[PDB]
Curated annotation (Swiss-Prot), chains A, B:
Organism of this sequence: Escherichia coli (strain K12)
CC terms in the record's Gene Ontology section: toxin-antitoxin complex; transcription repressor complex
A Gene Ontology biological process term: negative regulation of DNA-templated transcription
Function text: Toxic component of a type II toxin-antitoxin (TA) system, functioning in plasmid maintainence. Responsible for the post-segregational killing (PSK) of plasmid-free cells, also referred to as a plasmid addiction system. Half-life of over 2 hours. Cell killing by CcdB is accompanied by filamentation, defects in chromosome and plasmid segregation, defects in cell division, formation of anucleate cells, decreased DNA synthesis and plasmid loss.
Gene that encodes it: ccdB
Protein name per the record: Toxin CcdB
Amino acid sequence: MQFKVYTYKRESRYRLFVDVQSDIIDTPGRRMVIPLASARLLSDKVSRELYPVVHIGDESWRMMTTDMASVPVSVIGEEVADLSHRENDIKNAINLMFWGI
Amino acid sequence: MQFKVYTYKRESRYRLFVDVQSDIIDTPGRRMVIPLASARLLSDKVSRELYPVVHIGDESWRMMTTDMASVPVSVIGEEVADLSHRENDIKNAINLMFWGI
Ligand SMILES: [Cl-]
Ligand SMILES: [Cl-]
Ligand SMILES: [Cl-]
Ligand SMILES: [Cl-]
Ligand SMILES: [Cl-]
Ligand SMILES: [Cl-]
């Protein structure tokens, strides 16, 4: 479901992903998502508009907008959080990636 | 470059992909793309608004919007066509996937 965050059942580069696909867009067995990388060692020079910083599990994460990809529902693990409250920054980052400023 | 179509140097599910990332968005060594599937046997029931039909190599192709993913520049092969003339349908499909109608 859109803006919900889940873990991967099968190991991936990153450990969490936020579903960014519309809830009215039906793609049987799959969902478009954006991975979240730990912002623990990641550089601050990175555009926050394109790569929003979110907070889950008492830590900071970077939404890896440019690593967007679809995942089969078979790999969708437990839901760990809801990022719907960050819809504005998430929307802006996605739009920026395709259409610029 | 945005809206340009290329072949994969390494075999993938599909054989062509259209670069949909903004030309002002810099992601060293990678680009966000959408694969194109042959519309030869593919069903007509599929939403054309979400999955635009384009023409390359004297054949019809379906832009697999929901299979969007980034590819490393190392796998980007020869450029075969330019779909910039279909910017309107491409833009609408991408936007629809995330934000609905
Ligand atoms: Cl990480
Ligand atoms: Cl947050
Ligand atoms: Cl599901
Ligand atoms: Cl094909
Ligand atoms: Cl066309
Ligand atoms: Cl390049």
